[PDB]
Design a protein around this ligand. Structure first.
Ligand SMILES: [Mg+2]
Ligand SMILES: [Mg+2]
Ligand SMILES: [Mg+2]
Ligand SMILES: [Mg+2]
Ligand SMILES: [Mg+2]
Ligand SMILES: [Mg+2]
Ligand SMILES: [Mg+2]
Ligand SMILES: [Mg+2]
Ligand SMILES: [Mg+2]
Ligand SMILES: [Mg+2]
Ligand SMILES: [Mg+2]
Ligand SMILES: [Mg+2]
Ligand SMILES: [Mg+2]
Ligand SMILES: [Mg+2]
Ligand SMILES: [Mg+2]
Ligand SMILES: [Mg+2]
Ligand SMILES: [Mg+2]
Ligand SMILES: [Mg+2]
Ligand SMILES: [Mg+2]
Ligand SMILES: [Mg+2]
Ligand SMILES: [Mg+2]
Ligand SMILES: [Mg+2]
Ligand SMILES: [Mg+2]
Ligand SMILES: [Mg+2]
Ligand SMILES: [Mg+2]
Ligand SMILES: [Mg+2]
Ligand SMILES: [Mg+2]
Ligand SMILES: [Mg+2]
Ligand SMILES: [Mg+2]
Ligand SMILES: [Mg+2]
Ligand SMILES: [Mg+2]
Ligand SMILES: [Mg+2]
Ligand SMILES: [Mg+2]
Ligand SMILES: [Mg+2]
Ligand SMILES: [Mg+2]
Ligand SMILES: [Mg+2]
Ligand SMILES: [Mg+2]
Ligand SMILES: [Mg+2]
Ligand SMILES: [Mg+2]
Ligand SMILES: [Mg+2]
Ligand SMILES: [Mg+2]
Ligand SMILES: [Mg+2]
Lengths: 96, 50, 79, 64
RNA sequence: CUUUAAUGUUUGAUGUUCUAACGUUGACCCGUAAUCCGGGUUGCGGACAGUGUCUGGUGGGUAGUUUGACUGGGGCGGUCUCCUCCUAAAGAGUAACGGAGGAGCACGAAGGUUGGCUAAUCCUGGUCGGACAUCAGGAGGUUAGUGCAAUGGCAUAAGCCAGCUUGACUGCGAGCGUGACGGCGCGAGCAGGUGCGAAAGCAGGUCAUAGUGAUCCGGUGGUUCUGAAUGGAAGGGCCAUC
RNA sequence: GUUUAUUAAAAACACAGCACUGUGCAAACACGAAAGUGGACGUAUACGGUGUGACGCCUGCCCGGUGCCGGAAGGUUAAUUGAUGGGGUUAGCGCAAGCGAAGCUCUUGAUCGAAGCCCCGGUAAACGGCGGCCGUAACUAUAACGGUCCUAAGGUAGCGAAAUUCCUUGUCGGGUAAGUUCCGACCUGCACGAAUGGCGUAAUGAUGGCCAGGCUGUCUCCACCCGAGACUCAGUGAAAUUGAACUCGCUGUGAAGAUGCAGUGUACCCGCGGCAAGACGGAAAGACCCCGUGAACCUUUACUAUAGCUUGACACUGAACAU
RNA sequence: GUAACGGGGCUAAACCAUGCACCGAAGCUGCGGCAGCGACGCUUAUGCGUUGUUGGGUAGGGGAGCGUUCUGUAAGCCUG
RNA sequence: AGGACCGAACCGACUAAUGUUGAAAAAUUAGCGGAUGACUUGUGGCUGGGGGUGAAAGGCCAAUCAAACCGGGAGAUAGCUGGUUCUCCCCGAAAGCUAUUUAGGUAGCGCCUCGUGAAUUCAUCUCCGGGGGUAGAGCACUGUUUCGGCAACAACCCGAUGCAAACUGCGAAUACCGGAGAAUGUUAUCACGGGAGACACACGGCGGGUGCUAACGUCCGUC
RNA sequence: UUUUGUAUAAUGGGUCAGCGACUUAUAUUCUGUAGCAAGGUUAACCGAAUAGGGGAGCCGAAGGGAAACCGAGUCUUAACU
RNA sequence: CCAUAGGUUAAUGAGGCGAACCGGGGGAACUGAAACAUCUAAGUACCCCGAGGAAAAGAAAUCAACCGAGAUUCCCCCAG
């Protein structure tokens, strides 16, 4: 960071802070998943046991990854309006 | 200097306001002139000005 | 002793001599502190506060001399 | 030992879609009345590191 | 109940007296045929002194340090940021303890628009009006004026007068210029609402270029962004600002 | 008398004498976290601190500033106590807006508050200070003398070209053939002056300066001689230094002062005794000078702290009374 | 110490114009050789001959190697 | 009697020479001062390092003293100085700008190297399109300057003559910017990324400031 | 060696032989290289110890916003630009 | 007066030494911050006391989050 003696870049520039303190416990599931959520019903949890979330997580989305195929029904979770399609498009259902 | 800073407040309930300077040493009359109030997104009468 | 000091860079000059690519609004001439040194004419005008010869619509630059009493005058025809 | 991150820098920068970081513009928190709104308006948003100092940024944030 | 009391009672401010903590480097007794120390007695002093914690003063007695750089060696003197001209070899840009000046502001109008105007100076002729006021003509032509330096500019005036006004508006911004960077500058056009004008249209402060201080730490207003079991709240973020 | 053991013996320190100041004794004070101890088995004719430094004649004016001493009425002020108002929460109130008690909390600080400082007086053998323009004269003059403006007040006695005078070898007198030194004067004291003492002073001094008689090889100008080295032989046997040497002069050249480059002059090979002009000779990573956001110790009204001294509050700390 | 052509010495061995010849370097050419890149015979991974071209170098960057001690291959190989 | 007098021992140390790889890490020789006193000396004791002791020089405290010696923290820190070891091949700088309690240090940019991308990118010449106010020149302007002409000593004005970095009613070469074209140039160009070093330059030519159009002077531009 | 520049009268070395200075641990990023691939890889520990087991966990395939949040979009804004 | 204080005797036990590790009392500066006070170095070095084969710690007035975990200690993660 030192550059002679002048106010370092990480000095002259302001500091915009504030950390979610929540997004840390909010995962992001992808369409590439589910087909590995051990059978159907993508329970709020399960994914954890499926080793792809985190024992700490409390919230998560489905998002569009580009997969689904097998008819799966997410339970106790959220999902984009673009993912809540391919999901049902493959014979899936949403909990909410 | 002698030019104090002024805070033109909106007549609307909105806490929006403008900022500028004035020479109260000769212009005791409280300045008003009407400007744009972003909050209400409509022009109005701004006040407060030594 | 008093003698010293001086302004900084302050470029100001022709940055778009004659015909050029003349984008949406290059500069063509930022020779501030003027109006007659370079006059706003043709498709180009603007002439911002700092007497900077704007330059509108894309095209080539002309660099002419018209109207009573010399008067440089700049503009940007199509290319 | 694990490299220590320059906390100060990790509070003014943030890696973007890629190598970039994008920071916070200066001159927007002090003496603002005598400043052109057009100026400050063009200061509220964020901006990537000038690439010239990018090298430095990518040193104080080893774990960026 | 409301003023001033009287006793009562409390509780502070002094100030006296007391003994019983506490002091005694007075006297005596025992441990002890010890100047120590401890116990006892007596005298003196006495809630003082003194000590602990807290606190105002004092404090080179002691301690840790600071006490700039440029510089025709150093020092002395001067300088340090910003604007203008020359140096600068007709693009930009260039050095010296090179040659010359200025800025740290000013304006609610000295901003905006619409409408209108145009000087300095000399000659001549005119009450008091003379070197130099006001008036009439003629010559003259940006030699005037420009809020403040200098350069460039200005008559379509930016120079001058008046009416009406608040565009010295909010959100954005094609595209450029200029910086190592932080950053600084120019900007047509778009959206919302203004104003001035019959209208085209002009206005996002002043003719332009000086009139300035990054970050941090905080203060104020706004916001249902966040808020450590939950609901709030403190605090934090974001926007405006000191 | 004392002193820098190892470049300073002095005009320096000390001294008896003088003065100021503190100290009532469990003294002041000093060593010590304390116990304790020195001061002193002393007690104001005593002890400590400070300055001056026998003795003689003396020791002027200034208290504005800083320090110290006394006052302490009034202004300002610590901790302490915590009035008072404000906020968060919530029982209840209410379709809702908001309002909200009590409690708990967060904040606010009335009020009580000593020394200190400000303020009043003193104090110079306390730290210290002792005039500027220049006022009015034998041609001009010149302005020591001293008007006027302002000081806290403007240097008294004595001394003065001095251990103090820059101009400076001031000017005059003395001494000398000739004296920037010396002695005696003048006063124009750059910039003496009265216990950070003034002017003197017999005696004293390995003390500074000047002069004279004696005396001389100090010198004119060196000569001879007696001894210890040097020289020779025999025995023992160092040193610093040292890139390598086939290690000349000159004139020029050159990182700017050449044994080594250019030109040229000169020169058979090697010792011994002598001398020091050069090898920028040897010795010590220059001590002067600058630089390093180096070090140390010292100073102070630099900054920040702190022992010590001192203030008040609460505690150990109780009983009454008067107001 | 000649010391203001390097010296000798020069009346032209000075100077001017003109012209030819010659000496002169690590420059250019010739002959042989080496390495990087492009090219051809090619061949036809590869790789070499013919050729165009490049090869001064401090700080410094890039790329190839030599040798040393010790481990495995070593109950091998070499060795009185 | 006496910090009295002369002078050995004893104590001390003013002068000179010699010594200075000494006889000696302070002495020898010849002189010198005190010598009944604040004198001198033997033995043992007591004060310990920011501390002691000091008739005060910062002197002495074991050949050490503006803070002893020994061991430790400890490989303190050293933007400074020195030193850095085998071979061959390729490329090849900088000594600048801007910040900097910065100026003999650093950092971004610039210049070197290496990798990866990409275009007729880039260069020279030709031609085409540009703005220019330098050289020069000139004197309307801004100043400066003469010589003549109409001013109870002279400006203004007029004609004739000059001067100018901060004068311009003129004005090159030329540099620079852009467009088109051929040839040549192992891409010379631009971008991103790994490694840099370098920010003391020196001389000569040309244009200049400064200096004396002095300096192997100094400060720039450029080769 | 240091310098713009040294035969330099600037530094260092009398000579020889031996020794004498870019290392190591961890972390992070690149380049080469091998493995595997939208997957790669385990840590401690167990151990029938260089196996095998253990996938706690770390990195990557999703980003934008200060965040709630949304999501191949997302912020900015009243603006669906 | 009592009674204590004190005195004598006897029986027990301590005393001192020692490498580290361990608990406790006390506690630097160089250094880094490109200066330097806060801060750092670091509760390190060092001094002192005590203990064991280990010490220390330890069976929630712990944590979690409306599901639950269940003393202490050591390792890997979490995470620079
Ligand atoms: Mg997992
Ligand atoms: Mg000190
Ligand atoms: Mg220190
Ligand atoms: Mg300096
Ligand atoms: Mg130019
Ligand atoms: Mg008239
Ligand atoms: Mg202006
Ligand atoms: Mg004597
Ligand atoms: Mg001595
Ligand atoms: Mg002596
Ligand atoms: Mg004295
Ligand atoms: Mg007196
Ligand atoms: Mg004589
Ligand atoms: Mg005399
Ligand atoms: Mg005196
Ligand atoms: Mg005296
Ligand atoms: Mg002999
Ligand atoms: Mg012999
Ligand atoms: Mg010579
Ligand atoms: Mg000799
Ligand atoms: Mg020498
Ligand atoms: Mg040296
Ligand atoms: Mg030939
Ligand atoms: Mg040849
Ligand atoms: Mg080479
Ligand atoms: Mg005697
Ligand atoms: Mg005697
Ligand atoms: Mg003895
Ligand atoms: Mg000694
Ligand atoms: Mg250490
Ligand atoms: Mg060391
Ligand atoms: Mg600074
Ligand atoms: Mg000219
Ligand atoms: Mg040019
Ligand atoms: Mg530099
Ligand atoms: Mg330089
Ligand atoms: Mg230069
Ligand atoms: Mg030079
Ligand atoms: Mg030199
Ligand atoms: Mg040498
Ligand atoms: Mg060797
Ligand atoms: Mg430091």
């Amino acid at each position: 960071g030192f550059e002679g003696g002048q106010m370092p870049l990480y000095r002259r520039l302001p500091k915009f802070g504030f950390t979610s303190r929540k997004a840390a416990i909010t995962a992001e599931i992808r369409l590439s998943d589910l087909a590995k959520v051990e059978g159907g019903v993508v329970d709020l949890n399960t994914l954890k046991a499926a080793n792809i979330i985190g024992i700490q997580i409390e919230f998560a989305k489905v998002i569009l990854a580009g997969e689904v195929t097998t008819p799966v029904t997410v339970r106790g979770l959220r999902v984009t309006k673009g993912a809540r399609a391919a999901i049902e498009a493959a014979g899936g259902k949403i909990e909410e | 200097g002698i030019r104090e800073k002024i805070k033109l407040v909106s007549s609307a309930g909105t806490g929006h306001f403008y900022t500028t300077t004035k020479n109260k040493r000769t212009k005791p009359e409280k300045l008003e002139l009407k400007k744009f109030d972003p909050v209400v997104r409509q022009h109005v009468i701004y006040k407060e000005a030594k | 002793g008093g003698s010293t000091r001086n302004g900084r860079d302050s470029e100001a000059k022709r940055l778009g001599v004659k015909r050029f690519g003349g984008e949406s609004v290059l500069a063509g001439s930022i020779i501030v502190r003027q109006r007659g040194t370079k006059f706003h004419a043709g498709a180009n005008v603007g002439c911002g506060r700092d007497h900077t010869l704007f330059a509108k619509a894309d095209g080539k630059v002309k660099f002419e001399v018209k109207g009573p009493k010399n008067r440089k005058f700049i503009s940007i025809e199509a290319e | 030992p694990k490299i220590k991150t320059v906390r100060g820098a990790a509070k003014r920068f943030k890696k973007t879609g890629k190598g970039g970081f994008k920071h916070k513009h200066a001159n927007l928190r002090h003496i603002l009345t005598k400043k052109a709104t057009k100026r400050k308006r063009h200061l509220r948003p964020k901006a990537m590191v000038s690439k010239g100092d990018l090298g430095l940024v990518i040193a104080c944030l080893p774990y960026a």
